[PDB]
Design a protein around this ligand. Structure first.
Ligand SMILES: Cc1cn([C@H]2C[C@H]3O[C@](c4ccc(I)cc4)(P(=O)(O)O)OC[C@H]3O2)c(=O)[nH]c1=O
Ligand SMILES: Cc1cn([C@H]2C[C@H]3O[C@](c4ccc(I)cc4)(P(=O)(O)O)OC[C@H]3O2)c(=O)[nH]c1=O
Ligand SMILES: [Mg+2]
Ligand SMILES: [Mg+2]
Lengths: 201, 201
């Protein structure tokens, strides 16, 4: 909830794909369904952030097939929420002196993706939560105290972002050793409130 | 253009509606076309930021008719660029040590608007410029040196935004007296480079 007028609430940016919405599991399900005769990558075997790069190493042409999954209508809209994500963000947004924004990057093909990201937020958090969405390719220009995001290295135009990046565990980053003092949130079952409280005055 | 790796480019947020895209003129044209039997507000007579509030004072029910214009498919997409806007932003983006983002707020009804804002940017600035778009209801959480925006009072979750707000003149704000030392850009013919240079070290 917002701080009193003029006051300064803790500000938390919560990523969408891989944090709120199960991009990797959705991707694999639809890839298997659409391309049953191709090899796939089990979630346990995912390595590197970019799904299509691993698929391309698997077999010539599989990268383009992978891309066609997320370019398709209803791919973003039909992603399942991660366990605990909706409940946690609803709780988080209800906390005193706490402003939560959902901060997400749309893909390059923009016909469906931005629209469906709005629709997905509406479906799970309600119409009033649409006020909290920020779409950007560059999260470094968004100022906050915390950014909870599955992408290990987040860089952009601002060489010194204001947020602390808390790495949200995902199949593709779960084996990564991080530079101290970088922190992880394992899942939404993990103690996200402690992380927030550690940033409060 | 981006600063050298690690370096810090001047960062300019450029608003879309009323700065790049002629929302007010588009609105009036389509309102007149759709509702030829209703009274309208000449651009010279626009007062207050919110178009629908003035229309509602004009006649009971006109507010809802006004809203239906911008909720319609192709309203955002078919807006004409303001004179000089495309040329200026292209020049601006080519300047050394200068990062330009188009920062826009989508309307509440999200079926068309975000999509069409991406499409409009693609149409006028090209596909690579899509990397520069930030969609947000709250521009105070976007960090930059400058925000060129027609809306007179821009507030939100960050009580002390990092940008200087330069008011871009529009039919609805052209008579407003501003608090010193607040600055205006009259139009894209006006000397926007001087404004930028005044923020450079
Ligand atoms: C968010 C995300 C996206 N992707 C896919 C989606 C598509 O997203 C992108 C992408 C998405 C956002 C950014 I910033 C940069 C690149 P595309 O360039 O827009 O198509 O990168 C190539 C593709 O990789 C992934 O494989 N894993 C992810 O976690
Ligand atoms: C950008 C802009 C929007 N509007 C119209 C558009 C629609 O935009 C909104 C609007 C848009 C952005 C914000 I932040 C807050 C409100 P809507 O609540 O999304 O429908 O406000 C009511 C309407 O007013 C205007 O009348 N003038 C403007 O310059
Ligand atoms: Mg992510
Ligand atoms: Mg505007």
């Amino acid at each position: 909830s917002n701080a009193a007028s003029g006051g300064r609430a803790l500000r938390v940016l919560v990523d969408m794909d891989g944090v709120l919405a199960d991009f990797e599991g959705g991707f694999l399900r639809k890839f298997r369904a659409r391309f049953p005769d191709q090899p796939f990558i089990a979630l346990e075997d995912r390595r590197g952030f970019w799904v299509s790069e691993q698929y391309g190493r698997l077999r010539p042409g599989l990268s383009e097939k992978a891309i066609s999954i997320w370019e398709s209508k209803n791919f973003f809209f039909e992603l399942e929420p991660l366990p605990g994500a909706v409940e946690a963000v609803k709780e988080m947004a209800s906390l005193q002196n706490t402003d939560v924004f959902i901060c997400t990057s749309p893909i390059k093909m923009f016909k469906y993706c931005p629209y469906e990201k709005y629709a997905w937020v509406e479906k799970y958090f309600g119409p009033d939560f649409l006020e909290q969405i920020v779409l950007t390719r560059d999260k470094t220009v968004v100022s906050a105290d915390l950014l909870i995001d599955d992408r290990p290295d987040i860089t952009g135009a601002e060489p010194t972002p204001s947020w602390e990046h808390v790495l949200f565990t995902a199949c593709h980053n779960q084996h990564l050793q991080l530079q101290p003092p970088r922190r992880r949130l394992h899942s939404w079952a993990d103690d996200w409130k402690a992380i927030l409280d550690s940033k409060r005055p």
